[PDB]
C-alpha cells in the first residue's frame, strides 16, 4: 500500500437488472468502477474489461450483488495477483437519491 | 475491509432544520449519504431507506447531529450487522461554503 | 475512527496570496476545506468558521503553508478536542492544472 | 499521517501515448495527479511540476506505466522526503468508461 | 428585446405529478425555470415565487402541462407586464433521458 | 413563438454509428435532443420517444445525418403539428473536442 | 447579427447586496455575464472589466437592478459601439432555486 | 432557419496566445466552438477540423480576434455554403471570470 493500482473509472453498461416487469422488458444503465492491485507488455486490463463488458451486456441479472460478484470473479479468473475491488452503481435506483451501489473485494 | 459495502449516494430530503424563524416556518434541503457494511433475497436497503425517508420528512429537527444520530440508529434497528456510517450535508449552511456536514458511525 | 466528524466543504475566500506584483495588488480566490473530529447546544463550528473567515480576509499571506497553519491553529485555539485537518486549494495556481493544495493536520 | 501533504490536481498534458498508428501520429490528453508528503522559502512544488511538464510534453510514451514511473522518479529526484504518489488518467481510453488510470507510490 | 428580463433559475420543488400508483403515493422532484419581461422598491419576483412555490407544493398534478399553465397564470395574475415564459422539467421522466420539459409563454 | 414547446433532454442511446471496423463491431453512445412545437390526455411524447428509441437501438447507421433525419421523420409521422427540431451528438467523435452534432428541423 | 461579439463569462464578484441586517454586514457572491457587440490593438475589454470590478467591489448596492444598470452604463461609457447586454446572478437568492438574475441591454 | 446545422463542441487546443513574456514562452489552453450551416458521403467536417487544429497548433497568435478570424476563414475556404460562426474561449483570461470569448460569423 499504495504501490501498483489500476483504476477503471465509470464503465457505463446497459443490461437487464431487476425482476419487475419494466426491469425485465427494458435494459437500464449501471456504472462499474474497478480497482486492481498488481505489484510492481501488459495487455491485461484491456482483456479484463473486454470480458466484463461481454459478460454484463450478454446476460440478465436479478440483483446488483450477483452482478458485482460475477464481475469480481471475472477479475481474478485470469491473473492470480493481488487485490481487486468492484463497485456497481445503479443510478437513480432510489427515489430522491443519485445512486445506490454495491462494493465487493478480494485477495 | 473492504468486503460487503452498500452505499446510498446523495439522498436529498426536505425537512425543517434549525430554530431560526425562517428555519421553523420553511423546509430546507439536506443531503444524506449512507455507508452500510454487511459481510458476505435481500429486501434490506430498500426498507432502511424507506424508514429513513419517512422519519426525516415526517419530523422537525433542531440540530444536524440529532438528525444524523436518529438516522444512524434507524440503520442499526433492523439488522445487527456490521458497520454503519451516515453523513448529512446541510447545503449552503455557511456563507461562502458549498456545505457543512456531520458524520457519525457505529459497530 | 470514524465516529464524530464535521466537514466544512469548499469555503471560498478572497485574500492576498503571493509576493508577485499582481498577487500583492489583487486579491485571489482560495478554497478551504476543514475536517474536525470531536467525539461524541454546539454553537462551535459557526464560531470556528467566523474566526477563520475573519482571519483570512483581513490579512495578507506570503505562502499557502502559512495560511493553512494559521487556520489549523485557529481551529485548535478554542476546543481541546480532538483531531483537525485543513486543506487549502489555490485554484489554477499551476499552468494546465485545476489546483494545488496544502494539507496540514493535528492532534 | 496526515501531516504535510501537497496535492497537484488534474495536471492536463498532451503527449504521445500508445503504439497504434493514430496514437503515434497524434498527441492525446492525459491527466496527472500528484500527492507529495514532506513533514513539517519552499520553491519546490513549482520546480517539480516544471520538470514533470517538460519531461512529459518533450517525449513519446509506450505505456501509461512507463510514463507514471518516469514522473514518480522525477518527483523523488530532487528531495529525499518523504512519500510520493502519482496517478495518471488516460481519459476515454476504454469504450463506455470515463477513464483508466495507473497509480504508483514510493518511500 | 432584450431590455428588462428577470430569470428564476432551477426552482426545485417536490409535489405529486402523474396518475400511476407510485406517482400518487409519493412526491417527486420537478424543476421550474421562469423568464419574466417587465420594461424598464420592486418586491415583485419574491411574491411571484412565494405564490408559485405555495401553489405547487400544496396541490396534486395530473400532467406537466396543467402544472406549467397554472404557474404561468400565477405569473400574470399580479402584474399586467409584459411577457412571461415558464419551463417545467420532470427529471428522469423518460428512460435514458436526463429530463422532459414543457414550456409555455404569454403576452 | 414561444407558446407550446416540449423538450426531450439528453436521450442517451447506444447503436452502431460509422463504417470503420471498430464502429461496425461495437455499439457507441450517441445523445439525442428533441424539440417539438404543438400549440396550444396527451399520451404523445411517450410514444414518440418509444418509437425513436426502438428505431435507434434496433438498427445500424452509416452517418449521423441519416440517423438524425430518420428520427426527425419519426417525429412528424404521427402528429401533423407543428415544428420539430432534432440534434444528435456523437460524443468524443473528434480528437480534443467534447462532441460533434447534427441538427435538422421541419415544418 | 451575429458578427463581432465578445463575452465575459461568469465574472464572480463579492460586494454588499440587499438591505437586510446580514446583507449589509456581510459581502455576498454575485455573478456577472457581459455580452458586447462591436463590429468588425484592442486594449478595450480589459479596461471595461477593470472598471466594472472596481465599481462593484468598492460600493454597496440596494437592489440587483441598480447594480446591473450601473454596470451596463460603465460598459457604454467608453466606446459608442454597438450593443451591450448584462446579466447579474444572485446565487441562491431564493429558497429551492439555484439563482435569480436580472438582465438589461442597450443600443 | 433552423435546417442543417453541424456543431463542433469544445475543441480544446493548445497554442501561444498573447504577447506577455509568459504567454510567448508557454502554450495555453483555448476552447473553440464551431457552428456550420449547409442545407440540406460528407467527409467535410472532419477535414475542416483537421485544418483548424493544424493551423491553430502550428502557429503563434497575438490576439483572440486574429485567431478567431483565421479559423472562420478556414471554415469558408473549402465549401461556399452557407453560414459559419466561430467562438473562441480563452479560459481564465480575466481575474474572477471563468472565461472571455470572441465570436465572429459569416455568409
Number of residues that make up chain H: 107
Shortest distance, CA G59 to any CA of chain H (angstroms)? 17
Q: Given CB atoms, is A28 within the 8 Å cutoff of chain E? A: yes
Phi, psi of E39 (to 5 degrees): -60, 140
The residue to which cell 437488472 is assigned: A17
Give the neighbours of chain A: at least 3 Cβ pairs within 8 Å: B, D, E, F
Instruction: Name the grid cell of D50.
Output: 516544471
DSSP state of G73: H
Q: A and H: touch, per 3+ CB pairs < 8 A?
A: no
Q: Does B100 touch chain C (CB under 8 A)?
A: yes
Distance (Å, whole) CA E103 – CA E97 = 17
Q: What is the secondary structure of C43-94 as a DSSP string? A: -HHHHHHHHHHHHHHTSEES-HHHHHHHHHHHHHHS---SEEEEEEEEET-S
- Residues of chain A found within 8 Å of residue E18, distances taken between Cβ atoms: none
**Cell numbers that stand for G67 in this block:** 447594480
Reported structure resolution in angstroms: 3.0
Closest by CA position to H32, among listed H107, H78, H85, H98: H85
Please state at what angle helix F44-57 crosses helix F64-77, rounded to 10 degrees: 150
Q: Is B100 on the interface with A (CB under 8 A)?
A: no
Alpha carbon distance H89, E39 (integer Å): 32
Beta strand E5-17 pairing with G83-91: unpaired
Closest CA to C34 of C75, C69, C4, C66: C75
Neighbours of D47 (CB within 10 A): 10
Cβ neighbours of F44 (radius 10 Å): 14
**Is the peptide bond prior to G2 cis by the omega test (within 30 degrees of 0)?**
yes
G12 touches chain B (CB under 8 A): no
B5 CB-contact burial (10 Å; exposed 0-12 / middle 13-18 / buried 19+) = buried
Q: Is the peptide bond before D23 cis (omega within 30 degrees of 0)?
A: no
Residue A6 in contact with residue A36, Cβ under 8 Å?
yes
Interface test with F, best of A10, A12, A13, A14 (most F CBs within 10 A): A14
Sign of CA dihedral F44, F49, F54, F60: positive
Cβ neighbourhood burial of D56 (10 Å; 0-12, 13-18, 19+)? buried
Experimental method reported for this structure: X-ray
| Cβ atoms C24, C15 nearer than 8 A | no
Residues in Cβ contact with B47 at an 8 Å cutoff, skipping those fewer than 6 apart: B78
Q: Give me the helices (H) in D7-105, please.
A: 21-25, 44-57, 64-77
Contact yes or no for E72/E36 (Cβ under 8 A): no
Between the alpha carbon of residue D77 and those of residues A2, D6, E44, the distances in Å are 20, 17, 64
**Which residues of chain G have a CB within 8 Å of the CB of C12?**
29
Q: How far is CA D37 from CA D5, D40, E101, F91, in A?
A: 5, 9, 50, 38
Cβ–Cβ of B63/C42 closer than 8 Å?
yes
Report yes or no: D28 at the F interface, CB cutoff 8 Å: yes
Place of cell 488518467: D89
Chain D interface, best mutation among F96, F97, F98, by max D CB count within 10 A: F96
Q: Mention every residue, 6+ apart, whose C-beta is less than 8 A from residue D98.
A: A9, A10, D91, D92
Contact B28 G95 (CB under 8 A): yes
Chain C neighbours among B 35-64 (CB < 8 Å)?
63
Which among B84, B103, B106 is the top mutation candidate for probing chain C, defined by the most C β-carbons within 10 Å of its own β-carbon? B103
| Residue H28 neighbours by CB under 8 Å, 6+ apart | C95, H14, H15, H16, H17, H18, H90
Residues of B with CB below 8 A from C7's CB?
A: 87, 99-103
Alpha-carbon distances, residue G67 vs E2, E39, F52, G55, G74 (angstroms): 18, 16, 47, 9, 11
Chains F and C, touching by 3 or more CB pairs within 8 angstroms: no
How many angstroms separate the CA atoms of D50 and D44, rounded? 10
Which residue in chain G has the smallest CA separation from E30? G96
Residues 6+ apart with CB under 8 A from B66: none
CB atoms within 10 A of CB E58: 8
Chain Cα centroid distance, residue H93: 16
- SS3 string, chain B, reads CCCCEEEEEEEEEEEEECCCHHHHHCCEEEEEEEEEECCCCCCHHHHHHHHHHHHHHCCEECCHHHHHHHHHHHHHHCCCCCEEEEEEEEECCCCCEEEEEEEEEEC
Pairing of strands B97-106, B60-61: unpaired
In the complex, which subunits touch G with 3 or more CB pairs below 8 angstroms? B, C, E, H
Find the angle CA(F3)-CA(F8)-CA(F13) to the nearest 5 degrees.
160
Q: How far apart are CA E31 and CA E26, in angstroms?
A: 17
Cβ(C90)–Cβ(D45) below 8 Å: no
Dihedral sign computed on CA atoms, order E84, E90, E93, E94: positive
Please, which chains are in contact with F (at least 3 CB pairs closer than 8 A)?
A, D, E, H
Q: How far apart are CA E10 and CA D97, in angstroms?
A: 29
**CATH number of domain containing D22:** 3.30.1130.10
Domain that includes residue D99, residue range: 1-107
Kindly state whether H29 is in contact with chain C, defined as any CB-CB distance less than 8 angstroms: yes
Secondary structure of residue D66 in the 3-state scheme = helix
Answer whether C77's CB lies under 8 Å from C61's CB. Answer: no
Chains contacting H (3 or more CB pairs within 8 Å):
C, D, F, G
In contact, A31 and A89? CB cutoff 8 Å: yes
Give chain G positions within 8 Å (CB) of B96: 29
Nearest CA-CA partner of D63 in D38, D34, D100: D100
Phi-psi region of H86 (alpha: psi -120 to 50; beta: other; left: phi over 0): beta
Host H or E run for residue F88: strand F83-91
Considering its fold, how many domains does chain A have in total?
A: 1
Answer whether C89 touches D (CB < 8 Å).
Answer: yes
Q: How far apart are CA A43 and CA D48, in angstroms?
A: 31
B107 contact A CB<8A: no
Count Cβ atoms within 10 A of the Cβ of residue B77 and give its class: 0-12 exposed, 13-18 middle, 19 or more buried.
Answer: exposed
Whether chain H has a CB inside 8 Å of the CB on G95: the answer is: no
> How close are the terminal C-alpha atoms of chain A, in Å?
14
Chain centroid to Cα A94, Å, comes to: 19
Q: In the structure, do chain B and chain D come into contact, i.e. share 3 or more CB pairs under 8 Å?
A: no
Q: How far is CA D32 from CA A96, D6, F70, in A?
A: 34, 14, 42
- Return all residues near E10 (Cβ < 8 A) that are at least 6 apart: E31, E32, E33, G97, G98, G99
Contact present, H4 and F96 (Cβ < 8 Å): no
- Please report how many Cα atoms fall inside a 13 Å half-sphere around the Cα of residue H49, on the Cβ side: 23
- Which position has the grid cell 423518460? E94
Neighbours of E69 (CB within 10 A): 17
* Residue among H31, H69, H96, H99 with most chain G CBs within 10 A, to mutate: H96
Question: Which of G15, G46, G10 lies closest to G31 in space, CA to CA?
Answer: G10
Contacts 24+ apart (CB under 8 A), G37-44: G37/G3, G37/G4, G37/G5, G37/G81, G37/G82, G37/G83, G37/G84, G38/G4, G38/G6, G38/G79, G38/G81, G38/G82, G39/G3, G39/G4, G39/G81, G39/G82, G40/G3, G40/G4, G41/H63, G42/H63, G42/H65, G44/G78, G44/G79
Other beta carbons less than 10 A from residue B93's beta carbon: 21
Contact G83, G105 (CB under 8 A): yes
Task: Give the chain H residue nearest G57 (alpha carbons).
Answer: H96
Query: Cβ of A33: how many Cβ atoms within 10 Å?
Result: 18
Instruction: Give the residue from chain C lying closest to D9, CA to CA.
Output: C99
Q: Which of C30, C34, C69, C100 to substitute to test the interface with D, most D CBs within 10 Å?
A: C100
Q: What is the 3-state secondary structure (H, E, C) of chain A?
A: CCCCEEEEEEEEEEEEECCCHHHHHCCEEEEEEEEEECCCCCCHHHHHHHHHHHHHHCCEECCHHHHHHHHHHHHHHCCCCCEEEEEEEEECCCCCEEEEEEEEEEC
Amino acid at each position: 500500500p499504495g504501490m501498483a493500482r489500476i483504476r477503471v473509472k465509470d464503465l457505463r453498461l446497459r443490461t437487464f437488472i431487476g425482476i419487475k416487469e419494466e426491469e425485465i422488458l427494458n435494459k437500464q444503465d449501471v456504472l462499474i468502477n474497478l480497482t486492481i492491485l498488481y505489484p510492481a507488455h501488459a495487455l491485461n486490463y484491456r482483456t479484463i474489461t473486454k470480458a466484463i463488458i461481454r459478460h454484463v451486456e450478454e446476460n440478465r441479472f436479478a440483483l446488483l450483488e450477483r452482478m458485482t460478484q460475477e464481475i469480481l470473479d471475472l477479475v481474478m479468473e485470469n491473473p492470480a495477483v493481488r487485490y481487486a475491488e468492484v463497485e456497481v452503481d445503479k443510478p437513480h435506483a432510489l427515489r430522491f437519491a443519485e445512486s445506490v451501489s454495491i462494493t465487493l473485494a478480494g485477495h
